[PDB]
């Protein structure tokens, strides 16, 4: 059924993150936490129903275009209880000025903007997991080979959401938040593209790879 998908989306979700725990994820330091989050995103995408039966390239075309959305919507999800503040982990709560200090720039404001928008919906666990896999399928990349296969996966998850929004207008309301997610993700990327170019702040393998995959 459709809840067999939903309950698999619930199962496959990355565990609650903590910066300084103590059985969950090990224990980081500062921004390696973000590096870990790319990795968690990547492995998640594999586990998405329909995904791993794309070609290897389309899996990469998909990931390279929307990976930051998926990530950011995750961080939106954690920050849902708190007001005017960003839940990096459960441990890590950062306000607007907290964000500037760690060299995030204007990103605090940007990310609160998205948080507010989802807060205005009291977004649910099942609903979020459904929307994140939906964001994943909603790629937009001129590099995708099988156009139909992604579209079918897209239609599929949206139908999964519709069949769920019954146990009614909440489908679209969730969907309506997606443009801000992409825009927000894009400001995150554009920021660290400046950092990249400044070349002073050191950056880790996967993140540069993702950054470089984008312009060309």
């Amino acid at each position: 059924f459709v809840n067999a998908l939903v309950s698999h989306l619930l199962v496959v979700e990355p565990e609650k993150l903590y910066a300084m725990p103590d059985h969950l994820p090990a224990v980081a330091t500062l921004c390696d936490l973000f590096d870990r989050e790319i990795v968690v995103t990547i492995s998640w995408a594999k586990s998405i129903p329909g995904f791993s039966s794309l070609s290897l390239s389309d899996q990469m075309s998909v990931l390279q275009s929307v990976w930051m959305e998926v990530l950011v919507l995750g961080v939106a999800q954690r920050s849902l209880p708190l007001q005017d503040e960003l839940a990096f982990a459960e441990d890590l709560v950062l306000d607007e000025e907290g964000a500037r200090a760690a060299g995030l720039g204007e990103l605090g404001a940007a990310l609160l903007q998205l948080v507010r928008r989802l807060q205005a919906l009291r977004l649910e666990r099942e609903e979020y997991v459904l929307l994140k896999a939906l964001a994943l399928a909603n790629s937009d990349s001129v590099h995708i080979e099988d156009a139909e296969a992604v579209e079918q996966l897209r239609e599929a998850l949206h139908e999964a959401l519709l069949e769920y929004e019954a146990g009614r207008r909440r489908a679209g309301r969730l969907l309506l938040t997606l443009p801000l997610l992409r825009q927000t993700a894009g400001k995150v990327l554009a920021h660290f593209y400046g950092v990249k170019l400044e070349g002073k702040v050191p950056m880790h393998k996967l993140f540069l790879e993702m950054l470089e995959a984008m312009m060309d």
Binding site: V39, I42, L56, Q64, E209
Partner: peptide, 12 residues
């Protein structure tokens, strides 16, 4: 430069 770190995870 192929997507090395990305390839790893998607094929591990």
């Amino acid at each position: 430069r192929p997507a090395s770190e990305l390839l790893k995870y998607l094929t591990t």
